Amino acid sequence: MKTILSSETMDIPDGITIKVKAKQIEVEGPRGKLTRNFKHLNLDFQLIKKKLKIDAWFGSRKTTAAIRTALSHVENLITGVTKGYRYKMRFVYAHFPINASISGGNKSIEIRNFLGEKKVRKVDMLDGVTVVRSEKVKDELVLDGNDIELVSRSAALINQKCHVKNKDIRKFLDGIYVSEKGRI
Amino acid sequence: VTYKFHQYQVVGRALPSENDEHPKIYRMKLWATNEVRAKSKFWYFLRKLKKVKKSNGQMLAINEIFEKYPTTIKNYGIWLRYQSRTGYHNMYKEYRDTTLNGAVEQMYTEMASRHRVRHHCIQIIKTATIPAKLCKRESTKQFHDSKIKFPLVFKKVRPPSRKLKTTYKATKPNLFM
Amino acid sequence: SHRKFEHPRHGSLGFLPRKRAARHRGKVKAFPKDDPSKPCKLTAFLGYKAGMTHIVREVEKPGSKLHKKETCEAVTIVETPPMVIVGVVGYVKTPRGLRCLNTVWAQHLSEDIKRRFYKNWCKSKKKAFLKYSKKYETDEGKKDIQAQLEKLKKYACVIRVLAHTQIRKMKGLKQKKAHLMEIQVNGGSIAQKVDFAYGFFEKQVPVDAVFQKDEMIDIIGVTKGKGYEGVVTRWGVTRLPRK
Amino acid sequence: VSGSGISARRIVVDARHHMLGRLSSILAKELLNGQRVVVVRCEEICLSGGLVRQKMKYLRFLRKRMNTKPSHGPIHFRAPSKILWRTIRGMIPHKTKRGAAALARLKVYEGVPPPYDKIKRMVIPDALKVLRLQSGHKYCLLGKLSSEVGWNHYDTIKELENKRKERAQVAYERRKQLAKLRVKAEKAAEEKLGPQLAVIEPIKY
Amino acid sequence: PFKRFVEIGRVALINYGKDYGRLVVIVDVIDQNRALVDAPDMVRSQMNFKRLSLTDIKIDIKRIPKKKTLVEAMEAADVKTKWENSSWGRKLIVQKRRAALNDFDRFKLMLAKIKRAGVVRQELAKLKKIAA
Amino acid sequence: VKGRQGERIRLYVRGTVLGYKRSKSNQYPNTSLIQIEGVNTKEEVDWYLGKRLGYIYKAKTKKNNSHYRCIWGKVCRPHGNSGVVRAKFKSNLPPKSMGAKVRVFMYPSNI
RNA sequence: CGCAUGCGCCCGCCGUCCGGCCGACCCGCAGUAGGGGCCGGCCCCCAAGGGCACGUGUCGUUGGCUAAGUCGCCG
RNA sequence: GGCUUGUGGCAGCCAAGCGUUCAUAGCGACGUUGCUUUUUGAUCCUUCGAUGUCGGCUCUUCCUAUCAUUGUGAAGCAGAA
RNA sequence: UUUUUGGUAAGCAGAACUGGCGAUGCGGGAUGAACCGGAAGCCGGGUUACGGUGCCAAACUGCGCGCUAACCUAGAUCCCACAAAGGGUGUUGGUCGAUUAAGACAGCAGC
């Protein structure tokens, strides 16, 4: 059962310069510029004027599922260049304090003393992502950037770098976890 | 012009006997590829539904039924019974076609595709021309639009005839919707 | 059925076939990766194995049993007189690997290197590179030589120098036919490599310009020959019972 | 597939975005009919099913080896040109003289080496991806597959192709300008040619 | 943004079969694969989209109109004149004309082309020496 | 202008010798399959039916002061749906002629 | 890349003589849910299904002249 | 060696019950579906103008239904095991 | 093939009717005594059977509809060279019932 036409629309803010050509969307705002390649989607992107219209013709239920995904990605780009994204992480430990060392212009972090281990864990932030230790809150990291995927993925790298092993993780709750998914 | 399946009215009765000099006359509307196969399927049902075998029966009339308006589009509903690999089932199907012959051809093709049901495992219970407002299947409803509009997403690239076919060409096909 | 007991196989299948090498001089199968940011420098050198002896030194290995103790360790003496650069060769990076583009030789070649080009040097007329050496004597010929060098600077991606040993200086070897090999030049741009190579034409490069003290090096050569040999000695399979 | 049947001294085929198997079968028939074929840009051939499936298939191929003497085959070529060559060999009776001669009329190259960089290159519609593969279905390039199975020249071909394309763009501009200079010439010649243009008018597109 | 759509009134070219080269009007749509087409010189019938090439011409008609209504709508929009005057429609006409040339006509065309080429080449040479 | 030296008029079309009439397991050399350049359908083959065919090849020795030899044939019937034809020659063509070219003349003429 | 045989060998010519062609003309790249050309509007595409070429003479008659143009050969 | 797989070996499904509580952490009664040819039988197709008939020694290669080693999920996994 | 006894079963053993092989090539089933077609003097032409028409390899990458996407070697033709119970919010059809513009469902808000 292929529906003849499935379409969804979104409103482009007033202070955003959106450029679309051959499923190559470029969004420019006060914070910077973001671009995503949507050539892998068999959809029809159109700017009508400002609004963005995405249509799928004679697409199966799987094909039409990408319509909302495309709009959400475009919406994230608009929010990235307007408000930005801010992910907050909290150190969790029972006995050994977790020591963090920001270096390289807030583009890198080193974790020491995780569960008393002498190994040093080094994580490099992705492009456009900066990590800063919060001062208002105790043992809190703040990651900021424009691309949600890069900021969120940077937080995931830190979280997975500090997994406890050979222990009951239910009791050994040590680690660095994302506590807030917000925007600047 | 040419149809795979033809609709026939077959009329028959049991042979007259001393007890019944005027036995009941039975009629059926059957689908078959030609008259000979229509008659054979008529006796199949009379044998199993009225207990009248061809050996003790009489064929009276056979006439082919043609679509009245073969130039307009109608919605056709088909009630059928079919045999799967594990039993028997009933289903209702809808089709859009200019003639009921085409709609029946689509039904057999669909049953073969979606259910692997061969022709001889299908019995047509009822057929009817459904008005647009009484259709049930969404595959038929979506084309009930006065402003029907869509592009040709998939095109078949080919020369008008094989006379203009060449193995090699200087440039790739130029396609746009 | 499965073998009764398990032991590792005898010998390595990574050194097959166990044939006589098709060469006497050790071939460099791979040169060090080139770092353009570093100065032009040679990557290989030829030497001759003189013999072995032992030395005593005081070890400085914190945490070791030998820390501040003396250890006796065997060493090998390799006599490495300076090599003479006699040419330059450039390679172009192609989809079929490196291809030799051109070879430019020096004007003057020693008798020792010229012997490498003959099977019977004394009986020959010794015509090698005589006509080639003449084009260094004319202005038009000199321009052609310089044009060939500029061609390497433009297309070559890998530059190697042709260098030979001064085998006459080691009378114990009893050999006058010198050994020639291509030594890759690493560091700098392609133009610097060509200028580096051409500047050494007919000059000597000491071993100290290539290696230094306390660094790790790789030694390439052909092992001692031993002729036809049985499986026990050749592969290390255990002997069968006496009976 | 009966064959093109055209009379040509040589046919140069650009294999970019051609399905490997369908291109192979057509070329195999052309070679068997006595046609000499040159295939360029074999690294851009497309294989349906995606990289993961095609990579797994090649790894199964790498398993096959004569246990007692691996040098006795099968030989597992890694370069795109050789993979295409071996694919065609499977569609030819290569163990007969007729088949061997047919294979000897085939040449395969990665990229577009000279002199074929200045020779017209044709395509084969029956093997084109745009006509044979539905948009959205998985496929991989033969060059990408070759790189992951031990072909280390992918970058070299990529740089040489970029250099060739830029030179071709410069040549294209020269012809583009020469065409603009020729439309003026015909307009000037229009006055001289009055009767001639009348005859050609019904035939001109 | 697509340029051509399947809709009531769209003029289509039959690109395959016996009816190749003829123009038809889509008067109704059966399903995704089939449409109801009608032309002044043919009976209304269904055909697959695989045999149709949509054009830029689109007349204003209602669904399944009468033949008289269809004919006047096409004449009001000059469907035939627009198609034949267009580059796409002229290509089909020229192909038929070239195939219909007899031996003598081909000889005349050869002379005209040869003379045309000779004069054009001379003009180019002047545009080379002068406008180098 | 080209300055070419060769035949000044061509009154024939080239045809490729594809093989013999055959099955998956048997071969019939008395009939040959010829592909005529430009003929892509069985209907187009009707024009060439009965047309004379010439298989010209070179021998090592000279006969009548020439190394050329000619075996004559003609188009008998179409083969398949894609314009291939069946041809008969005064003698069965040798397998060496597979992939070679033959001249398809325009005579005998019915037009 | 070096050196290459004096009654030999290698080249540039001229003849002698020997073992599949017939216009065998043609370099844009890229995309295909698009790409260009012109002034958001209007056009082009929708197969080289094109274009180019004395393409015209017994593989081509004799004797001249020959503007430019095209083509081959040659430093 | 081949067919077969009763027997031998290995695996799954249902969930009565066990598991302090708690069908399914770990187990699976009563039943039921399979796989394997490293057991033994059944058969007698090949070999009786002969295929050298136990085991060990030696040596290579292969399988996975994984004993240890690398990376992980689960627990009636605090740690250790 | 079918009926049929012993046996867990067997390319096992034993009967019933007919055909086949053995004694027989030939086309198809890649390959095969028995399966499908079909039985034959030596030849030319025509047409078929079974089986086929992307290449190997004679005949369509023919004209149509749908289904499938296999990160297990997806699957690919009587005999025939295997696969089961049991499962999947993979996807596609169908059957029965329930709810919904008097406002359902999700989320949000204070029934």
Ligand SMILES: [K+]
């Ligand atoms: K053993």
Ligand SMILES: [K+]
């Ligand atoms: K040893």
Ligand SMILES: [K+]
């Ligand atoms: K021993």
Ligand SMILES: [K+]
């Ligand atoms: K001429």
Ligand SMILES: [K+]
């Ligand atoms: K068993």
Ligand SMILES: [K+]
């Ligand atoms: K025996």
Ligand SMILES: [K+]
């Ligand atoms: K299902």
Ligand SMILES: [Mg+2]
């Ligand atoms: Mg533990």
Ligand SMILES: [Mg+2]
């Ligand atoms: Mg190596």
Ligand SMILES: [Mg+2]
């Ligand atoms: Mg010795």
Ligand SMILES: [Mg+2]
């Ligand atoms: Mg064929």
Ligand SMILES: [Mg+2]
């Ligand atoms: Mg049990």
Ligand SMILES: [Mg+2]
């Ligand atoms: Mg014996």
Ligand SMILES: [Mg+2]
């Ligand atoms: Mg013996």
Ligand SMILES: [Mg+2]
């Ligand atoms: Mg023996």
Ligand SMILES: [Mg+2]
């Ligand atoms: Mg396992």
